[PDB]
Amino acid sequence: MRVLGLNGWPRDFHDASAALLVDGRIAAFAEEERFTRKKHGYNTAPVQAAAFCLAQAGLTVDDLDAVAFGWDLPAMYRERLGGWPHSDSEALDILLPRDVFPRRTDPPLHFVQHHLAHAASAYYFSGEDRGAVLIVDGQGEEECVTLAHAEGGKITVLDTVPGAWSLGFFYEHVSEYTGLGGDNPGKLMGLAAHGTTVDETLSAFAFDSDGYRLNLIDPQARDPEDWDEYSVTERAWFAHLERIYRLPPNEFVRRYDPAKGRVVRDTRRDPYEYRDLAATAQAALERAVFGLADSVLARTGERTLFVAGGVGLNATMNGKLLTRSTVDKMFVPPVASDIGVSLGAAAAVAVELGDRIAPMGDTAAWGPEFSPDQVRAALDRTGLAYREPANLEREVAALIASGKVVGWAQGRGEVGPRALGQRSLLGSAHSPTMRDHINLRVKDREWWRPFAPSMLRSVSDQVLEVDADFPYMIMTTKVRAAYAERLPSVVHEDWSTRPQTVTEASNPRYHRMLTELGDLVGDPVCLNTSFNDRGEPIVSSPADALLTFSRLPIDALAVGPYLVTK
Numbered sequence: 001m002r003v004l005g006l007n008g009w010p011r012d013f014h015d016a017s018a019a020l021l022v023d024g025r026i027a028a029f030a031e032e033e034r035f036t037r038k039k040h041g042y043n044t045a046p047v048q049a050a051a052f053c054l055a056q057a058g059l060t061v062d063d064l065d066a067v068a069f070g071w072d073l074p075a076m077y078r079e080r081l082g083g084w085p086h087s088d089s090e091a092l093d094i095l096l097p098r099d100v101f102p103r104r105t106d107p108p109l110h111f112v113q114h115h116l117a118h119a120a121s122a123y124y125f126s127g128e129d130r131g132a133v134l135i136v137d138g139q140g141e142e143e144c145v146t147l148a149h150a151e152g153g154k155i156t157v158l159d160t161v162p163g164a165w166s167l168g169f170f171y172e173h174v175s176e177y178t179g180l181g182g183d184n185p186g187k188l189m190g191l192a193a194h195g196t197t198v199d200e201t202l203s204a205f206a207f208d209s210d211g212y213r214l215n216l217i218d219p220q221a222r223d224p225e226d227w228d229e230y231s232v233t234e235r236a237w238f239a240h241l242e243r244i245y246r247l248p249p250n251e252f253v254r255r256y257d258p259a260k261g262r263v264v265r266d267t268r269r270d271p272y273e274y275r276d277l278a279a280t281a282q283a284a285l286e287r288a289v290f291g292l293a294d295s296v297l298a299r300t301g302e303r304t305l306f307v308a309g310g311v312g313l314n315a316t317m318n319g320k321l322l323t324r325s326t327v328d329k330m331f332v333p334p335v336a337s338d339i340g341v342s343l344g345a346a347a348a349v350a351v352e353l354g355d356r357i358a359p360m361g362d363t364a365a366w367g368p369e370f371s372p373d374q375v376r377a378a379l380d381r382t383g384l385a386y387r388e389p390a391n392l393e394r395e396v397a398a399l400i401a402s403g404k405v406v407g408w409a410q411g412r413g414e415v416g417p418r419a420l421g422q423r424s425l426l427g428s429a430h431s432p433t434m435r436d437h438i439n440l441r442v443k444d445r446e447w448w449r450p451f452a453p454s455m456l457r458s459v460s461d462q463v464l465e466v467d468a469d470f471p472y473m474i475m476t477t478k479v480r481a482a483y484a485e486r487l488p489s490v491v492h493e494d495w496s497t498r499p500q501t502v503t504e505a506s507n508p509r510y511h512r513m514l515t516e517l518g519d520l521v522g523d524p525v526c527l528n529t530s531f532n533d534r535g536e537p538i539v540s541s542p543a544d545a546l547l548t549f550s551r552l553p554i555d556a557l558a559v560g561p562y563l564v565t566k
């Protein structure tokens with residue numbers, strides 16, 4: 001079967017994306033923001049991402065057996081907006097505009113329950129026949145948590161938690177309260193290790209062995225004038241935090257900056273001042289989820305755990321889940337957030353049509369790639385001089401070994417928020433000055449943000465405490481004795497690191513470059529951060545890469561077989 005999965009809708013939506021399954025295989029998968037250059041893919045059908053999928057597979061809508069959407073959108077409309085006004089045909093015209101998607105007839109349209117879509121994106125691509133399922137996000141149609149049993153190709157829901165008790169909204173609200181912003185919860189997670197936890201209840205959570213309780217909020221609270229509990233939970237958390245925490249909310253400031261010639265946005269207070277709040281929210285989140293995970297694992301008698309939903313992006317929480325006595329194996333896809341429900345809706349539908357889903361297999365590289373000719377055309381448009389090295393990977397390894405920052409744009413773009421050696425900025429892992437240099441000079445980040453390493457899977461057992469696959473950087477782990485001080489640029493405040501392990505099959509070029517680098521600095525390990533400037537999505541096209549390269553004080557850009565130096 002050929003099944004196009006979608007997420008993204010013109011009214012109050014985020015993370016638009018499209019995924020195409022052909023006979024259970026990912027033929028193409030990408031997020032709208034990569035094409036639009038607008039972060040988060042807000043308020044739009046995944047027009048460009050879907051147009052990419054179809055071109056990639058050489059298909060039209062008429063070649064599709066089915067189109068799948070990662071929410072029960074009709075049910076949200078009937079319940080929250082007093083009616084679903086669209087025929088399937090009208091819904092498809094919005095999701096796949098005829099001016100971009102010509103079609104003779106309509107593919108069958110499927111709406112998939114949001115948390116089922118999350119779950120499908122974990123289970124079906126895990127390569128495990130059975131396990132416990134834990135979906136935690138902001139909110140699907142109603143529930144914010146889902147506990148389910150995956151076995152024999154089936155996903156059976158055991159329990160759910162109402163939206164008002166969302167851990168995602170909670171975490172997002174705290175993140176906003178600190179001035180890091182609700183759109184950057186990952187930064188709250190990074191700040192956490194710099195703070196101290198005094199009281200992980202936040203005077204709101206009560207924890208038990210099966211999860212958590214929130215007596216700060218009626219669990220049946222509902223916004224009558226919206227379709228999620230976000231505004232309800234926002235008012236309750238903001239009021240509560242202001243009562244119990246010594247600092248009021250951080251405010252955003254908008255002022256004209258004559259140096260930039262623009263009105264810029266800033267925070268009234270340094271978010272670092274809220275580090276104790278961050279540490280406390282992280283602890284509260286972990287403890288709640290721990291109970292949830294223990295609870296679903298015991299009920300199902302499983303020892304493999306599947307996690308998805310936005311909160312599943314909490315790599316710190318994930319790393320700790322994995323070391324837990326109740327867990328033997330974990331799979332979390334690179335697309336745990338709503339990005340992944342296009343793929344998940346497609347999988348749910350394809351499985352229903354009798355297809356069998358292939359494991360993702362240690363790569364997230366499903367986006368667009370570009371031929372040498374296409375890269376060259378982008379290069380020649382700019383009139384920059386460049387070379388085509390006889391051995392690009394050797395030369396890059398040497399650049400990195402010497403303390404330079406190299407941009408690396410190769411093959412299919414990765415899907416998800418992490419750069420994984422398709423669109424990455426590379427640097428020395430062994431340098432005690434590289435972290436400060438990249439934070440302050442290159443990626444315009446706060447001094448307290450850590451970086452993550454890429455390393456050969458072949459040496460990861462000696463470097464990391466745990467010997468498992470870490471293909472997605474979706475999980476943190478402790479660093480071993482020998483290396484905790486050998487790799488200063490990729491270690492965090494709490495002695496953790498967020499690793500990507502690289503198999504030769506998953507990325508031969510990247511694998512060969514790291515191998516080359518290993519011969520030079522002892523360990524085939526480098527710093528790998530996302531290839532983008534502060535206000536933009538990760539670069540996708542060779543024009544994107546060139547543009548970002550031009551405004552960052554980095555040393556070199558390795559794009560396709562070509563090498564560009566500053």
Ligand SMILES: NC(=O)OP(=O)(O)OC[C@H]1O[C@@H](n2cnc3c(N)ncnc32)[C@H](O)[C@@H]1O
Nearest residue numbers: 137138139168169172185310311314337338
């Ligand atoms: N449907 C729907 O809710 O979207 P979704 O499934 O994509 O999850 C979004 C949620 O993930 C939360 N979230 C994102 N990153 C997070 C992190 N590192 N730690 C905790 N929560 C996080 C974030 O606070 C937000 O509330």
Ligand SMILES: NC(=O)OP(=O)(O)OC[C@H]1O[C@@H](n2cnc3c(N)ncnc32)[C@H](O)[C@@H]1O
Nearest residue numbers: 418419450451452492496497498528529530
């Ligand atoms: N490849 C790629 O995606 O590079 P990126 O630098 O964009 O990494 C993503 C995020 O992980 C955060 N991060 C890195 N190491 C970490 C650690 N040990 N613990 C928590 N967060 C970490 C880091 O601060 C950043 O916010």
Ligand SMILES: [Fe+2]
Nearest residue numbers: 137309310338
């Ligand atoms: Fe979600």
Ligand code: NA
Nearest residue numbers: 322323324327
């Ligand atoms: Na364990």
